[PDB]
Amino acid sequence: PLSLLIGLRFSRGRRRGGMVSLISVISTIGIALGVAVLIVGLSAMNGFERELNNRILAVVPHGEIEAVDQPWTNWQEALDHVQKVPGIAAAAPYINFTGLVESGANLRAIQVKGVNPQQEQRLSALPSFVQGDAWRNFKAGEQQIIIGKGVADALKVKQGDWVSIMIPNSNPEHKLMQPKRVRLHVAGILQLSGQLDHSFAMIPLADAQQYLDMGSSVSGIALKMTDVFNANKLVRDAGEVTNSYVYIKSWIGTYGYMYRDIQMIRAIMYLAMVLVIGVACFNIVSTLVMAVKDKSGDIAVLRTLGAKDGLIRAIFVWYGLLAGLFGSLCGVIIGVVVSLQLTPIIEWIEKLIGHQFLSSDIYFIDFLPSELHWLDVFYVLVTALLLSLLASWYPARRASNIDPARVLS
Amino acid sequence: YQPVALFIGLRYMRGRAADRFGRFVSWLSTIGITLGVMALVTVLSVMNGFERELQNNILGLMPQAILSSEHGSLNPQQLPETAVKLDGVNRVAPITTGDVVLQSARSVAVGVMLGIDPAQKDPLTPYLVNVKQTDLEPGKYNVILGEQLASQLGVNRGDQIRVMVPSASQFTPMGRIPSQRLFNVIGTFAANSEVDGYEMLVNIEDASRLMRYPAGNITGWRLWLDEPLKVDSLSQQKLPEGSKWQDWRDRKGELFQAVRMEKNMMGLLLSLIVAVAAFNIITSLGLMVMEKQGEVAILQTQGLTPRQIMMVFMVQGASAGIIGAILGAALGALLASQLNNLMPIIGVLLDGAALPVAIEPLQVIVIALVAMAIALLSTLYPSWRAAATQPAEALR
């Protein structure tokens, strides 16, 4: 290799076993702990990002166009005008009611969405999340309703069960009294995430239109983007195409706290684990200082042979960098062994410790996901090596400018 | 007289003034412990402030505890408020709580009805907008809705909403009929909190009559707690005969549980730092013994016991740990409650309060003592090895 291989012999030159090799083991343990847990954290949050991409933002309407004064009289023209706006992948109509769902003496107040099945299939991957249903028999004019898992288990109902639906249908005339009590047939059960299944319940759009005895109109237009991170200005421009009296809403306003929470947690992990690697680099600094104080004779022998004032510094820099490499690789091994079996590891911890972690529906995914992006591993390992080099730089400069004969005598 | 080992241990920590770097190397362990304790203290204070804001915005505006009767409603004459005395409870007021469904002319929602007496103030009263608290007279069916709940219902002042309770439903051949009554809204409550989304205020008499309770009875006594987050411990106290105790854990417990579990997590995610710092101490001794064995030999030719050499190294390790922990806790207290000053000079992402800070001295003391104990556990082993190892074998 290169003439700096001295560092290797300075690293493998360990004798008098005990409390001189235990130091390297402890430094490796510190670096490995920091790097491995940082990698596990980053992979877990990448898995969280993936699970949010699949379960939540791929089923929710990315954009929302709701008429405020009167139900959309010309929703067809607005739909055709907005579907051709670039940055929009799909569009569909919907009608949004809210009513009393009742079954088996159990009553709830739930929001109901009416949408054409063939259009909502293009609109989102929501029907792909149904546990089981007849995708062919689900149509309009059949008294068919599909219920989320949370509402279904809170109502103690199952598939193929009859359910009462109460709708106000209030009018200025005396017809506001006696709210409509229609009957519906449960045909499917949704399983979206820890929170979304407790609110979503769909009926076909024509069924909703017949239930309200209204004309060919819908309560809003749902939009599916191609790029979701800039949906605010995009939906604003899309709604600017139609009348200005309409109200626009973006899924950003509802679920950007999830993005910023994931980014904030990733930043917190990175900063805290940079601190951990900094403490382990303090260990490395101590080890290299002792290495200089123990190999002053050898570096003097090197310098009396015509060594440069930067050669000894390079020897000790690579000594520190190799001590960093050993621990960093020993931690990356754990960070790849974990973060690929991370979910079974968490399941085993749950079996050992009877305490549920991400469940209780105050989060968006009962389990803990994992996904190993090797770019994140590369970033972590480069961070570890940069911290090790910063630690090693000053003891190296100290070694470069000391002559034992000059200072001892 | 103090132990002699104290002098030697305190003196080895200093010196090396001809290079000013070996002292830095020996103080690296203290610096690492200080940084770890700093991070722990400041982040735990920030999370304590966040959960304090949740407590003062979620729990601060909802019944913190409820003392009710075992069967049916509560009889105020049977259990007077004067006999309701317990630890941690600083105020008791009659209340009736119910889960209700609100039907408007525009939409329907689900909420929590709180029937209270207008004469007694509530944490919800300061937030009432153009609505007198005393205006909730009995028989008038007066209701004050939250701002978000009103927006969901689509009603305002002077509009009627049908409030129904299914728990008091009556079974008949025409099905189950929940209890129903029309209520007149006279304003909105603006709190900017999750509680405003589902909590509405009514007169206690109207709600009590609505739940099909006998006239004059109430659902229970709402109890304020000085420390409601420890309510589980207060759940184990002795209660008056025939009464049951319930708390917020029925409704908003899991969330708060998760929050605590979060805090605890970021409570280990940073604690690992000092754990690594503990390992650091080992290495320091594992080097310093190797850098001072030739001196320990001299101390071995004198009257020092090996059990006293272990003392003179463990006291150095412990002094490093104590200095690090104490100075880190001090700078954590100095840095917390001041981040709200440093944040303005840079870009601010959050809205309103910059960063809530609730420094509980008990937590700081507990974590400082834990750091000290871990430092002692780390320094125990190299000290023992230095005591047990004769210089000749290491040198030869």
């Binding site: 706290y257 105050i362 | 701002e147 978000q148």
Partner: peptide, 14 residues
């Protein structure tokens, strides 16, 4: 959860 204190209604529907 812990930062749940998000302003529950930031919508300001345009």
């Amino acid at each position: 959860s812990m930062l749940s204190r998000s302003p529950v209604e930031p919508v300001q529907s345009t």
